[PDB]
Each structure stands twice: as C-alpha cells, then as structure tokens.
Ligand SMILES: C=C(C)CCOP(=O)(O)OP(=O)(O)O
Ligand SMILES: C=C(C)CCOP(=O)(O)OP(=O)(O)O
Ligand SMILES: NCCC(O)(P(=O)(O)O)P(=O)(O)O
C-alpha cells in the first residue's frame with residue numbers, strides 16, 4: 073500500500089494544478105468553465121495511473137536527486153496522466169451512451185452541458201501539454217514525455233476505433249467476437265495509456281530512455297493491461313455499481329467483451345441462438361437473458377480461474393523482464409490490479 | 412494567384428500522406444476506417460491554410476536550400492494544418508448541429524457514423540504529430556512546430572468554449588452579444604489557427620524563430636483573422652450555399668455573430684424586441700423574421716463598408732509590421748481573403 077498514504081498527498085496537489093491552469097481577462101468566462109470541467113472530471117477516481125508516476129518516480133530516482141522541484145515535476149506529470157484519462161472518459165461516455173461515472177452522472181448527461189462536452193474533453197487533453205510546458209520545458213526528457221503522451225493518445229484512439237467497429241449498433245456481430253480480435257482491442261484501447269504510459273513517464277524522468285529497457289517494461293505492462301481490461305469487462309456485468317461507480321452497457325452496446333468471447337467459445341448451437349437474438353439490444357429482458365446465459369455457463373467461475381492463471385503468468389513475466397528495474401515498481405501495480 | 416497552380420500540386424501530395432498514415436495487421440480494420448475518415452474530411456476545401464504553409468515556405472527559404480526533401484517537409488506541414496482544420500470542423504459540426512460542410516452531408520450526420528465521429532476527429536488530430544514525427548523528427552525546428560500545433564489547438568478550444576458559453580441553447584443572450592465579447596471569441600476560435608499557425612509554421616521551417624518577428628507577424632495575421640470571421644458570419648446568412656458549401660445555423664444556434672452585434676448597435680427599442688422574441692430558436696419563421704430585420708437595418712451594406720475599412724486597415728498594418736519579411740507573404744493571403 074505504497075500509494076495508500078500517497079493518495080491524499082497527490083489529491084492535495086490538484087488545487088495548485090487548477091490555480092496554475094486557471095491563471096488576459098477577456099477569456100475569463102472560458103477559464104471559469106475549464107476550472108468547472110477539471111473539478112468535475114479529473115477528481116473522483118482511484119488515481120492509480122497518476123500515483124503510479126509518483127510511486128515509480130520515487131523508486132527509480134536516488135533520494136539525493138529527489139529535490140522539491142524534481143518531486144513537483146513528478147506529481148504534475150502524474151496529474152497529466154489523470155487529465156489524459158479524463159479526456160478519454162468524457163468522450164468514451166458519449167460514444168458508449170453511458171449514464172454514470174465515478175458515482176455521479178456523466179458530464180455530457182448534465183443539463184446545460186450536452187455535446188459541448190466534446191470541446192470540454194479536448195480542453196482536458198490541451199491542459200497536459202500546457203502543464204508539461206509549465207514544469208518540464210527546461211528538462212532533458214521534455215520531448216520524450218510530449219512524444220509519449222501524443223503516442224499514447226494515438227494508440228488509444230486506434231483502439232477505440234477497433235472497439236466501435238467491432239460493436240456496430242443494430243448489427244449482429246457475434247462472428248467478430250473472437251479471442252484474437254479481443255486481445256488487439258484491449259492492447260490499443262487500454263493497455264498502453266493505463267500501464268505503459270505512467271511507468272514510461274517515470275522512466276524518462278529518471279533518465280531511463282533505452283529502447284531495450286522500455287521494451288522489457290512494455291512486455292510486463294501490456295500483459296497487465298490485458299488483465300485489467302478483462303477484469304473491467306467482467307465488472308461491467310457482475311460488478312457492484314456502489315464499488316465500480318458506473319453502470320455497465322457492454323451487452324446493450326454490442327461490445328466485444330471478454331465474457332461474450334468466453335460465451336461463444338463454450339456455447340452449444342442452441343445457446344448461441346439465445347445470444348444472437350438478445351445481444352447488442354437496449355431491451356432490459358434481452359440483457360437479462362444474456363446475463364442468465366453467462367451464469368448458466370459459469371463464466372463468473374471461469375473468470376476466477378483466469379485471474380489466478382493470469383496472476384501467475386504476470387509474476388513469471390516480472391521474474392523474466394523486470395531487471396534492471398526494482399521489481400517493487402511492477403509488484404506495487406500488480407497489487408493495485410489483482411484482488 | 413500564387414496558390415492557383417500550386418492547388419493541384421498540393422492535392423496530388425495527399426495520396427502519399429494517406430499511404431504513409433495507412434502503412435501490424437491486427438489494427439487493419441481501424442486503419443481502413445482512418446483512411447475513410449481522412450478521405451471524407453481532409454478533402455473538398457479550398458486548402459488556403461495548407462497552401463499558405465507551402466507558398467510562405469517558398470517565399471522565406473533561398474531556392475538553393477529548397478531541396479526535394481525540404482519541400483516534401485513543407486507540403487507535409489501544410490497537410491498537418493489541413494488535418495488540424497478537419498479535426499476542428501468534424502467536432503464543431505456536431506456541437507453546432509450542422510447539416511452540410513464543403514458541399515456534402517456532415518460526417519457525423521452520415522448513417523452508421525453518428526457520435527463515433529468524436530473519436531474520428533481525435534484520430535485526425537493524432538495524425539498531425541504522426542506526420543511531424545515521420546518527416547520533421549531530425550530538423551532543428553521540430554519542437555517549435557509541435558509546440559505551435561499544440562498551442563494552436565488550446566487557443567481554438569478556449570475560443571470554442573467562449574463561442575458555446577455566449578450561445579446557450581434556450582437562453583436569450585442578447586445582453587452578451589457585445590463588440591468586446593465578439594473580438595475575443597473570433598481571436599481565439601479562428602484567428603490563431605487559420606492565419607498565425609500557417610505563416611508561423613513556415614517561419615520556424617525557414618529558421619525564423621525570433622519572438623519580435625513572430626509578434627510583428629501576429630499583429631497583421633490576427634487582424635486578418637478577425638475580418639475572415641466577420642466575412643464567415645456574414646456569409647452564414649447572406650452567402651450562397653452553392654459557393655459556401657455549408658448551410659448557416661448562427662441565428663438558430665444563438666451565436667454571437669457580427670451581424671447580431673451590428674443589429675443590437677443600430678436597433679430601436681421596438682426592433683430589439685423582435686430580435687429578442689425570434690433569435691436563438693429553431694422555427695424557420697423566427698429565423699426569417701431575424702433575416703428580415705437585418706435587411707431592414709441594411710446590415711449587408713454595413714458589411715460592404717466594413718470590408719473596405721478593414722482592407723485599408725490590414726494594408727496599413729502590413730506597411731507598419733511586415734519588415735523584414737517579404738510583403739508578398741501577407742499580400743497573397745490578403746488576396747485569398749478579400750474579394
Ligand atoms: C481503462 C479502464 C479499464 C477503465 C477506467 O479506468 P479506471 O478504473 O482507472 O478509472 P478511474 O479510477 O480513473 O475512475
Ligand atoms: C474558420 C473559418 C472561418 C471556417 C472554415 O474555414 P475555411 O473557409 O477555410 O474552410 P475550408 O476551405 O477548409 O473548407
Ligand atoms: N477503456 C476506457 C473505458 C472503459 O474501460 P469503461 O468501462 O467505460 O470505464 P471501456 O469498457 O469503454 O473500454
């Protein structure tokens with residue numbers, strides 16, 4: 073629990089991030105709206121990505137080099153990752169027609185916001201580079217960070233494209249829901265920005281810029297990302313919204329979920345037809361019918377066994393590729409992800 | 412007409428831009444969608460911003476330094492500006508609830524596209540930095556260009572925020588439609604990316620990176636941007652869609668248009684009430700009523716006089732601040748904008 077006490081210290085730095093980003097009186101009204109956007113969307117999460125930057129920074133840099141300004145740049149780059157997340161989620165909730173996020177109504181669903189949330193999400197993305205310029209402009213890793221935040225956006229956007237193309241509204245897409253398709257979607261849409269980006273940001277900030285070390289870390293982190301998305305898909309249906317903070321839509325949205333991939337792999341010809349007639353539709357009785365089929369195929373028990381096989385697999389990859397990084401960097405993140 | 416012959420040469424370079432951006436078989440389907448997005452949204456315009464990069468590059472660099480690779484980087488940076496435009500317009504058409512753009516139906520209005528256009532617009536933005544990396548990575552102006560494309564996005568997004576905040580759907584906002592408000596909106600939402608960004612990109616590519624020269628060029632270019640937006644607002648209502656390629660929505664969208672600012676400045680107490688009761692609403696009879704009031708206040712004649720006063724003003728600013736740049740750089744763009 074290296075991030076447990078570090079959680080409140082990280083959140084305490086948000087007020088300054090806002091003050092700096094909310095510092096030309098003509099654009100006053102727009103700046104007031106940006107503060108309102110930041111406060112609604114970048115707060116309320118677990119901050120696992122933002123904290124990973126800070127915790128990984130501390131574990132990779134010698135304390136004699138961890139000065140007040142150096143640490144300030146670490147929390148700031150941590151909050152840049154949280155703004156990247158906030159950008160993706162504001163937009164993903166519109167495209168996934170979501171209702172709630174982190175225990176409250178979706179920013180676009182708020183009266184008086186609507187489709188203006190599209191520009192609001194883009195302002196969240198713009199703020200990353202605004203922060204990187206304000207704090208990392210003179211640093212030798214400045215361009216490496218910008219290129220890493222830009223590349224992470226492209227990877228995710230390419231992943232979202234795959235996600236939306238495999239899930240067309242109104243079209244039976246069971247033929248597309250394969251294991252190979254699934255692994256490509258989750259690698260691009262989640263695994264790069266959620267696991268590779270926070271550790272790589274800390275690595276570049278610690279002067280670790282070698283291609284081999286970044287490739288070795290990536291081998292561990294992308295496999296961890298694959299599990300986090302399988303867990304996210306499992307919780308979309310079998311998770312408690314009081315804990316998850318959001319309401320699942322994967323069945324209604326005809327999404328290439330891990331569960332439907334597992335359903336199709338185990339379904340009898342009769343069970344496939346029930347799935348065909350009820351998947352990808354808005355009717356509650358159809359969604360209920362799909363959830364009834366999943367429970368009949370013991371997919372929650374199939375997920376339990378997967379979590380164990382996956383945990384053992386990621387641990388074998390940490391033993392294989394962690395060096396010369398402290399294994400604590402990868403274990404702390406494994407601890408946050410597995411329960 | 413320094414861009415007239417240069418138009419077809421610029422468009423001929425698009426096929427390679429697509430081939431390079433559409434060059435991991437797993438993401439094949441997403442890459443096919445990106446090509447479809449590029450071909451629908453980055454083609455059909457006048458390409459004035461993209462051509463300005465190329466024409467300004469030619470006029471600022473000595474021909475002995477204008478090699479095949481150097482020129483290739485110029486057309487590519489020109490197409491980066493066209494992709495920035497395509498990103499903003501795909502998103503602006505959703506938020507402005509537009510029907511057509513460049514003679515065809517809006518990408519989001521297309522059956523099977525919808526709100527997925529949000530991710531499509533973000534992929535267009537991602538492509539800029541993908542291109543800048545592929546062609547300008549080794550150049551000394553690489554970071555200056557990235558920072559200029561990022562800063563231009565923020566400026567525009569801050570401008571769009573002002574634009575949407577001044578135009579709330581369902582609220583009478585005539586008190587907000589002032590000359591001071593108007594000049595702030597158009598400076599941020601249009602003037603920076605449409606006029607400063609193409610010339611500044613060429614300036615950095617020509618090794619002109621001095622703050623004073625960039626400030627002097629900005630003085631001319633932002634004032635030119637203010638006129639281009641006044642002309643855009645005028646054409647929203649009094650322009651021919653066969654020429655403009657789009658259908659005006661400013662009255663229905665309760666936008667802080669130059670015309671409504673001019674209406675309010677000249678309206679009798681009785682005329683103000685007709686505007687109050689009919690502006691910002693979707694009913695055709697209400698929009699017709701507003702257009703009838705504008706024509707009664709001779710706003711098309713008021714625009715004619717403004718275009719002349721503005722032309723004389725921008726020409727005085729070129730005489731004042733053009734040096735040491737060739738005046739041809741600013742005159743060619745003035746020629747494209749004024750008619
Ligand atoms: C990409 C994933 C699977 C979904 C959201 O991530 P988080 O679970 O980290 O959400 P927040 O804590 O930031 O709200
Ligand atoms: C920002 C302005 C005022 C609107 C669109 O610009 P253009 O008139 O340049 O549009 P395209 O030629 O690119 O279609
Ligand atoms: N990966 C971003 C958002 C998600 O994880 P979320 O379940 O909406 O939070 P998705 O399932 O849409 O991929």
Ligand SMILES: NCCC(O)(P(=O)(O)O)P(=O)(O)O
Nearest residue numbers: 499503507600601643647657
């Ligand atoms: N500036 C971007 C788009 C516009 O010019 P357009 O008239 O929609 O092309 P707006 O009037 O919305 O500002």
Ligand SMILES: [Mg+2]
Nearest residue numbers: 164165168170
């Ligand atoms: Mg989602």
Ligand SMILES: [Mg+2]
Nearest residue numbers: 164165168235
């Ligand atoms: Mg999604």
Ligand SMILES: [Mg+2]
Nearest residue numbers: 304305308322
């Ligand atoms: Mg999910």
Ligand SMILES: [Mg+2]
Nearest residue numbers: 503504507509
């Ligand atoms: Mg518009």
Ligand SMILES: [Mg+2]
Nearest residue numbers: 503504507574
């Ligand atoms: Mg607009």
Ligand SMILES: [Mg+2]
Nearest residue numbers: 643644647661
């Ligand atoms: Mg307009």
